[PDB]
Amino acid sequence: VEPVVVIDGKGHLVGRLASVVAKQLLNGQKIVVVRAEELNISGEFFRNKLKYHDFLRKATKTRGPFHFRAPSRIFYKALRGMVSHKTARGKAALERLKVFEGIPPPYDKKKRVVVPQALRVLRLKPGRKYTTLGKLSTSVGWKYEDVVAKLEAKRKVSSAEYYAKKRAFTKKVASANATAAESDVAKQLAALGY
Amino acid sequence: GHLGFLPRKRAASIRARVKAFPKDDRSKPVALTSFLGYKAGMTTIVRDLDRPGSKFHKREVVEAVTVVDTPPVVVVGVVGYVETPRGLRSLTTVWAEHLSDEVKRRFYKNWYKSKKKAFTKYSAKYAQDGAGIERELARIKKYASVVRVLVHTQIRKTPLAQKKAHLAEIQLNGGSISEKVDWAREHFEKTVAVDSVFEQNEMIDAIAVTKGHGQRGYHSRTSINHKIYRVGKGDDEANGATSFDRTKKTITPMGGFVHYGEIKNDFIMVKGCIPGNRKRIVTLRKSLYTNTSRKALEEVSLKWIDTASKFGKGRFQTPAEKHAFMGTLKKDL
RNA sequence: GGCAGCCGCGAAGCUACAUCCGCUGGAUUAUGGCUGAACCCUCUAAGUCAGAUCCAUGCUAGAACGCGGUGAUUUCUUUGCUCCACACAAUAUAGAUGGAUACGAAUAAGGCGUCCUUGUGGCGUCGCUGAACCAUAGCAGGCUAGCAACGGUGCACUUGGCGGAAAGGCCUUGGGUGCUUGCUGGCGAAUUGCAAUGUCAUUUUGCGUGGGGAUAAAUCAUUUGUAUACGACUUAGA
RNA sequence: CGUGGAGGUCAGUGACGAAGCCUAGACCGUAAGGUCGGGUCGAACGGCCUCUAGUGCAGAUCUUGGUGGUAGUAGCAGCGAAACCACAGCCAAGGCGGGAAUCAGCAUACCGAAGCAGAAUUCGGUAA
RNA sequence: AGAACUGGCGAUGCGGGAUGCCGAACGUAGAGUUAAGGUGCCGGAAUACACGCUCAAGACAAAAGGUGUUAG
RNA sequence: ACCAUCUAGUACUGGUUCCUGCCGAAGUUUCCCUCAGGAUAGCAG
């Protein structure tokens, strides 16, 4: 297993993703979450928004409830309740977790991962309403969504050129393999499985 | 009591921290988004009310106006900022090669005891072909989004025993941040006048620390919708050179400004009073946007200006008034 | 008037019956419509326009258990401080024991190679798991011989570009120097006795040399008066 | 099991150190406890078979004596207590219970309807 | 609001139900299977399979209505 | 009002001291006009 695993929040579900991340953390696995602003939650926007606004006013009285606005912090709070926090084991587990909006460096130049069982599209029935989380964060007080999108747009650029270069390299490698075919070594490898 | 203006804990410095700027106009020519100065006493001014439908419409009306002791703003550097998901961040700071003694004093409390090793080796880096101090401009151009000029006030011109300089950042109105940094660099060590930014009838806002009653008072406050009535130039003479009262005198009250504020530099007249008392540094801003109301758009003239001293109740306007009625004054003549 | 005050003028402060000012943008709802089924109709089921509650602009404080940049880094604690090269110890790991092995977008479709009369296009085809890809052979990895290429790669340099979101990394030209298991040979492996993780990673700190770099700042004092219940704050001075 | 005393025994131990005291050193008995080594100690004690009783303490607003916070606080730059003291306390609710130190206090309008011409009025919803 | 009665405490541990009825009634230990109760995390256990339901619930109100959804 | 004795009086609070094993309930009835008392009915040796 990789020393650190980066999980793409795009098209994912907050609940299942948080549960699996917490379970892995308790097992002693380092995990990082990126593109958290694109995470999704089941149900329509109104239901999710009300469930969060009511939380902000449930009182402990500022010592307890905090009107935390960052969507990454909201996800951390969601995962916080799934871990045995306020203890050495639970607190140490949370130390192996980081959440960043978008994909800041150096995670950009590294292969991200997705959880097949935490995909919003995979587990959510088609045709049913869902919440993009970004709108909820913007409505509840978050104001960095515009800047997040603006600096993520540059992320798609440059990365596209890198993908094009890798595509050309793979084209050359495939051509070399195709012309390399029919060789004695290749024939022996094919016979012996490989 | 106001809920917004609580708690009443005192401000941490005499200078009021500005934390808002008039957006960023990408089409306007390069200009300063705010101005810095010092607050003097207060005076009285009368003008014609061109406001239509007013009870005193088309009639002379007296209005209370304060005077801000404005020293020339000399540029010492510029600061660039880049947008980030963690909020605005200052990526790099640069200075105008040379720094005056007043600016260096800002970093020192025991300046006399200290060996005076203020900005010096930094100037040595500038004392060459440039290299790093020139590549900083390119770095700012490449990534910066909003650029704030760094300037200080000519404290030694102000009649203040404290010769320590006061400096603050000012955003640049003009877009094309390349032009922002180019203009800032060209204006290094240059002197900027009030006319280069503000203008007559402009609805500026004032921010400063409130008076301390000796905890009530001594807290930062922002006052908006204040109209300038006349750009003042105290460096010259005959500041009262209005269209009326052709007996030119000086805005300085008899015997000087009460308590403090003997004007010896540029000044500005602003409608109403300003938070804080004299000796307090006050920053001026264009008030985000200009209201279209007549009270904010109409232009006003000026006439009578009170010059009697306030070291008591006030009576004599000029020293030449003392004659005729007093007869003989052997003690003097 | 030395002692104890009184009639006119008036501050110095206490301190109001004195004066000015007190802002513009979004998403909604109740509600009014559009398209359009459920079954002619329908503001609703898929969406949408107008439109007060929530957030923005602004103001106030600033995590004293948040963050970025910047003025300078003891000339003798016997290089005192700092960054480096080598060099011996302590210190421990929230826990290596080959490789975080980089597009985007949809999930009632997207790639890959090609064509081009360049498009939401045509053709062949891939998924149905990474159950893979890159590497992996040598005393835990040595010496040396021969063949084919000057390819692969460990490492000291050098020309240049990109990366400001937490850029602190990505490389690129040219040789230099080892290996090359791509192929064919000659050397030593033993005794740890039938195994005892059989010790190979760095996190921090301490002491011993040489290769450079710079040599300052704060408190009290003195005092200030914008401040001032007392702290505190604001200053001037080799 | 153990403490005070007594009958018989160990021809028992002990100034070459017994009683008592401490032990973050050990052993045994699951228990009342016993044993050993070490630091002080300076004059008598221990096991065994029996007899005997003023024989085992955490309480009793217990008795006698000693000792802490309070506290260098009121107090008289001084001189030095008392009261009180199992220990608690920052709140969300039910089983009657989610951080240094000192200085300063104890409502208006927005929609639809009325034979609502206008003015003006009433009603159903939003909302305090 | 008294009441004639039959199982259970008082003297009752332990597992489960966040905490106050179910299981099971007790020497000190090693090994294996279970009761109640559970198998997304806190929480040791299958984000197990199969048939439909539901858009706001879900771990005294059922007297009545819905152009809410699916069957005879 | 105080001082010493009869008086250490007149039945409701508080406390009731070392250890281990075994057995081990009851909370109700009987007989007198009850709460005061006992014969016992039952449980436990």
Curated annotation (Swiss-Prot), chain A:
Annotated S-S bridges: none
Function: Component of the ribosome, a large ribonucleoprotein complex responsible for the synthesis of proteins in the cell. The small ribosomal subunit (SSU) binds messenger RNAs (mRNAs) and translates the encoded message by selecting cognate aminoacyl-transfer RNA (tRNA) molecules. The large subunit (LSU) contains the ribosomal catalytic site termed the peptidyl transferase center (PTC), which catalyzes the formation of peptide bonds, thereby polymerizing the amino acids delivered by tRNAs into a polypeptide chain.
Gene name of this polypeptide: RPL16A
InterPro entries: Ribosomal_uL13 (IPR005822), Ribosomal_uL13_CS (IPR023563), Ribosomal_uL13_euk/arc (IPR005755), Ribosomal_uL13_sf (IPR036899)
UniProt-recorded name of the protein: Large ribosomal subunit protein uL13A
Species for this entry: Saccharomyces cerevisiae (strain ATCC 204508 / S288c) (Baker's yeast)
Keywords carried by this UniProt record: Acetylation, Cytoplasm, Isopeptide bond, Ribonucleoprotein, Ribosomal protein, Ubl conjugation
Cross-link annotation Glycyl lysine isopeptide (Lys-Gly) (interchain with G-Cter in ubiquitin), location: 172
Similarity field: Belongs to the universal ribosomal protein uL13 family.
From Swiss-Prot, chain B:
SUPFAM superfamilies found in the cross-reference section: Translation proteins
Task of the protein: Component of the ribosome, a large ribonucleoprotein complex responsible for the synthesis of proteins in the cell. The small ribosomal subunit (SSU) binds messenger RNAs (mRNAs) and translates the encoded message by selecting cognate aminoacyl-transfer RNA (tRNA) molecules. The large subunit (LSU) contains the ribosomal catalytic site termed the peptidyl transferase center (PTC), which catalyzes the formation of peptide bonds, thereby polymerizing the amino acids delivered by tRNAs into a polypeptide chain.
Swiss-Prot/TrEMBL keywords: Cytoplasm, Isopeptide bond, Methylation, Phosphoprotein, Ribonucleoprotein, Ribosomal protein, Ubl conjugation
Provenance organism: Saccharomyces cerevisiae (strain ATCC 204508 / S288c)
Oligomer status and interactors: Component of the large ribosomal subunit (LSU). Mature yeast ribosomes consist of a small (40S) and a large (60S) subunit. The 40S small subunit contains 1 molecule of ribosomal RNA (18S rRNA) and 33 different proteins (encoded by 57 genes). The large 60S subunit contains 3 rRNA molecules (25S, 5.8S and 5S rRNA) and 46 different proteins (encoded by 81 genes). uL3 forms together with ES39L one of the contact sites for the signal recognition particle that targets ribosomes to the endoplasmic reticulum membrane.
Keyword Ubl conjugation among UniProt keywords: yes
Cross-link (Glycyl lysine isopeptide (Lys-Gly) (interchain with G-Cter in ubiquitin)): 28, 125
Disruption phenotype: A mutant confers resistance to trichodermin, a trichotecene toxin produced by plant-pathogenic fungi.
InterPro entries on file: L3_arc_euk, Ribosomal_L3_dom_3_arc_sf, Ribosomal_uL3, Ribosomal_uL3_CS, Transl_B-barrel_sf
Localisation per UniProt entry: Cytoplasm
Phosphoserine modifications at: 13, 145, 243
UniProt GO BP: cytoplasmic translation; maintenance of translational fidelity; ribosomal large subunit assembly; rRNA processing; translation; translational elongation
UniProt miscellaneous comment: Present with 450 molecules/cell in log phase SD medium.
Any one of the GO CC terms: cytoplasm
The protein, known as: Large ribosomal subunit protein uL3
Chain positions found as Phosphothreonine: 92
Entry similarity comment: Belongs to the universal ribosomal protein uL3 family.
UniProt-recorded Gene Ontology molecular function terms: RNA binding; structural constituent of ribosome
One Pfam short name: Ribosomal_L3
